[PDB]
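Q: I'm a student working through a structural biology exercise. My instructor gave each of us a protein and asked us to get a predicted structure, then write a short paragraph describing it. Mine is Phosphatidylinositol-4,5-bisphosphate 3-kinase catalytic subunit gamma isoform. I'm not confident about reading structure output yet, so if you can add a plain explanation after the tokens, that would really help. Here is the sequence I was given:
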Amino acid sequence: SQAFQRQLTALIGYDVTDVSNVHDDELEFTRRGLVTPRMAEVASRDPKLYAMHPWVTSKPLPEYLWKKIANNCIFIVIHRSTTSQTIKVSPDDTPGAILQSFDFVLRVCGRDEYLVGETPIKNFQWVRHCLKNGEEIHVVLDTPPDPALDEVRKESLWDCDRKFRVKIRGIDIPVLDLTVFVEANIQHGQQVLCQRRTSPKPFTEEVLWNVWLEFSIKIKDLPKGALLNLQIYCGKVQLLYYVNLLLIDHRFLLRRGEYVLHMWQISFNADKLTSATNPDKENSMSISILLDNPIALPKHQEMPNQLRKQLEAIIATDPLNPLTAEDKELLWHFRYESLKHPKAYPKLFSSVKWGQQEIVAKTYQLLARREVWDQSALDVGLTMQLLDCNFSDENVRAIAVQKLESLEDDDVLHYLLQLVQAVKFEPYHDSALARFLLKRGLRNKRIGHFLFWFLRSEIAQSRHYQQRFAVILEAYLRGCGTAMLHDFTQQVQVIEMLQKVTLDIKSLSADVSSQVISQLKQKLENLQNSQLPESFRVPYDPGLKAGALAIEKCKVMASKKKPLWLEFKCADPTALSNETIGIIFKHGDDLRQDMLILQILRIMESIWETESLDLCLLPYGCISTGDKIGMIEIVKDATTIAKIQQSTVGNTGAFKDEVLNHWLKEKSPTEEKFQAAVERFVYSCAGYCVATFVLGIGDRHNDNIMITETGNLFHIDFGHIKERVPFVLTPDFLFVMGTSGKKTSPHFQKFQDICVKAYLALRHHTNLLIILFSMMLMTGMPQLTSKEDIEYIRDALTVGKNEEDAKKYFLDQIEVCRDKGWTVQFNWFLHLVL
Ligand SMILES: Cc1nc(N)nc(-n2c(Nc3cc[nH]n3)nc3ccccc32)n1
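A: Happy to help. First, here is the predicted structure for Phosphatidylinositol-4,5-bisphosphate 3-kinase catalytic subunit gamma isoform. I'll explain a few features afterward.
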């Protein structure tokens, strides 16, 4: 009966049906609100194409993949049983057209990945993947999966001229000397509309004021999505506690009556915005208030030359350049000229006096005349700007969500993480953005897979948002289908089993002793039978099904956080490879931070594809499963730069320029594969140099930088980030390029040519990276987020500068890395190792 919910609660990691932490019914209203858009999408999606989830793109095939193709021909090896045959196919051949040569379906060898539907084969991501790494395309003549397995179980305010007023009854803290006062804010966005304070009373375990705090704003002037933000400072001032309350609720009603709100502690931050109260009734500070103002909010239905240039200059500025009163007044008065420029929209809607009813009304009349916005080519950066912490207005936000509707599934996957994170900026649990994510996930198994893990990542470690996210996740699981529900169940079981082991093993050490290795092998063997399922989807690569542990190859690593090095057999017999699936299980790193950085790395890779560049980044899979815990895709055949330095020189900082180049030579079997490895490195190094510099994570110790035995360099472990260095371009990296100290080479000139083009290619997307960077810091970096933290990326991307000025600017950073040489790395050695 209700047993289905218990399953969902184990899948979610939180109990949606609990009501111990609500002062209203918004969450329950949202659950019931989402039934329709779920069922709507469940009824509309193509049952066949949903079962096989073809992963396709419409992006043009890049230059680097054309100049690799030969005579307009690619070979596809189709498999029967033991023997296989190879067929001549043109890039334009639809999977339906490949029937004639050989109803059945073409499933990729060793993966739950299908080549079906009305798209040319060049447009399938797996096909594009094989061409990049120079791999043969292997497929099987299989029977299309049954849609029955995906089957789903059947499921007036403006007539009110009164001033707003809040009765502060008092604060209550079960356990704690100075004085304390309460601050009440009417908020819209990050903007404080109206502020009133109490008097500083002695900070005891119970403090009562019983005061009426009358605001200057009127009830009619309160906009939808306005927060009463209640805060506690002590006294010399320092913030101690905060809590928020929506003044206009989910049913357009003015909030009314008695409230006792348990509050959040301290240590811009997305957590400061939440409508959730602290679930910890027993230990947290509370506050008691009264609102008493049946009141519902209604709904709605040439310039001089010198000024135009002032307007254009304002519109032209970056998203972090703040607006003065003068700028705002300009934007608002020329409302209609600003409306003609989509790029003006963030700035224009930040010039709105939201605490003024008639202005908001005019703004809404203004939104009804948005032909130019509706016709413009979708700009994600611009769209993302309207979904950040500076916009609390649903109608403003919904025109951003409108633009997201035209994104194809491939592009949704690119931005999905940060779209999920942007739910944290929504005033209300039921939003256009929450609904958009829900329907994109139910429309497609791959988006749906990742939507699950992203939401689950936050539910597991965010008291501030778990409730909202839990509701969306439940809404998702009730329409994804029995097949996936079973998939998710398997996966959840496996990782909750392996996390226990990770944490148990961590306890046993205070280096790796002889018996810890057997203790691990003992506990893994315990699981291999009862009760670990022998086949589960790899969360960061839903195309792979892992099978049995390779227990001989599993280890604990020589690091003070003692992570697990697990290896699995592939559960797919059709798998032509022999490779084990390698996953690191780790506690102690904030792998949320790794997720956000890795996702931006993917965006940079997609940016570079628009300009026919491939910089060979390895943005390894990574899933944060909980608080300072998660999994890491093992990149095979790889080792850290430091360990390469240790295995020749030893435990000293006397680093030798030659080692890396003669490490690569001994791993290359031919001279053909050596220069392939050298080239792959030149690109790799340049890819990471630029990407890390832009992000402010360039100065790293070199055992947090790795290389594969085929040249591919890649940074790892992105959690928590004398003189410095813009990035890591050490003399050993330079020796591979053929240069030494102060020279040039055919490979170094290439490296600069790649850097410059890559750097300027990101600069073409300045705004987008800026917004994703700001969002990242606010939603995933609880350590920091000051205004100055976010402003770093303006400098790094040299906003306002011409191309050549910025071209040189980077060439300088490269030159700085040569000037510094080993100094920074040597300092790091004295710092971390000693
Ligand atoms: C992506 C990747 N592939 C491989 N093979 N190995 C690692 N690796 C990581 N990964 C991460 C990622 C985030 N934190 N740590 N730590 C390591 C320590 C010593 C040797 C290898 C390590 N990472």
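A: Here are two points you could use in your paragraph. The first strand starts at residue 74 and ends at 79. The domain at 482-636 is CATH 3.30.1010.10 (Phosphatidylinositol 3-kinase Catalytic Subunit; Chain A, domain 4). It's a good idea to check both against the output above yourself.
Q: Great, thank you!
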